[PDB]
Amino acid sequence: NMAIIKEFMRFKVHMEGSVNGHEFEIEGEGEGRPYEGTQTAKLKVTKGGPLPFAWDILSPQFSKAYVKHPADIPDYLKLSFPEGFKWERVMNFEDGGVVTVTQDSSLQDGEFIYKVKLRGTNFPSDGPVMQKKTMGWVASSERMYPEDGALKGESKQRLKLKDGGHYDAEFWTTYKAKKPVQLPGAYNVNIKLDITSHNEDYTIVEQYERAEGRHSTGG
């Protein structure tokens, strides 16, 4: 519980982006329990729909204030509020596709405000992203560490495919508070991110995420 970060918190998110040159925008609203590590969101494509690419490359960009942390791991991103934090991400896919993301998180009138900019490039026209063959992310673990006054995370990620195969990516993210709050040591964040409902052309999508920090066991 907390005065700034309450046990139940809503957010609003705006994304502008392009993937292989296709421009789009998304608006959404979310809610969750920041100290329990759970959240949901409802997203709507508002420009450029229906998207000609897999929703799954967008789903991890819609909220790490909602990670459950044990008391002995400083919860840097919660401590950054009310001012908030920024994050920057590179996602390199095994077939050469690249997604870069920048994000601003703030708190306004008791709700989080998320502003996302996204650029996907170099996806093969034949690959599973532009052919919409992906079927969600496998549960994953983000390895966290402090560096140069920011919190960094790195993860190996895997998308399931309609043909029963998999499509891998590496994620690198830097999270920086707008004020100089306490950084944690190294630890792991276990993440499960699900698409819980969508319409036929993925112009209306709902997501759920559970995330929890746990002590590293070395790897």
Curated annotation (Swiss-Prot):
PTM summary: Contains a chromophore consisting of modified amino acid residues. The chromophore is formed by autocatalytic backbone condensation between Xaa-N and Gly-(N+2), oxidation of Tyr-(N+1) to didehydrotyrosine, and formation of a double bond to the alpha-amino nitrogen of residue Xaa-N. Maturation of the chromophore requires nothing other than molecular oxygen.
Keyword Transcription regulation: no
Gene Ontology biological-process entries: bioluminescence; generation of precursor metabolites and energy
Biotechnological applications: Fluorescent proteins have become a useful and ubiquitous tool for making chimeric proteins, where they function as a fluorescent protein tag. Typically they tolerate N- and C-terminal fusion to a broad variety of proteins. They have been expressed in most known cell types and are used as a noninvasive fluorescent marker in living cells and organisms. They enable a wide range of applications where they have functioned as a cell lineage tracer, reporter of gene expression, or as a measure of protein-protein interactions.
Highest taxon in the source lineage: Eukaryota
Residue pairs linked by disulfide bridges in the UniProt entry: none
Pfam name, any one: GFP
Keywords for this protein: Chromophore, Luminescence, Photoprotein
KW Acetylation (keyword) present: no
Family matches, as InterPro entries: GFP, GFP-related, Green_fluorescent_prot
Family: Belongs to the GFP family.
Oligomeric and partner information: Homotetramer.
Summary of the function given for this chain in its UniProt record: Thought to play a role in photoprotection of the coral's resident symbiont microalgae's photosystems from photoinhibition caused by high light levels found near the surface of coral reefs. In deeper water, the fluorescence may be to convert blue light into longer wavelengths more suitable for use in photosynthesis by the microalgal symbionts.
Protein name: Red fluorescent protein drFP583
UniProt organism field: Discosoma sp.
Lineage of the organism: Eukaryota, Metazoa, Cnidaria, Anthozoa, Hexacorallia
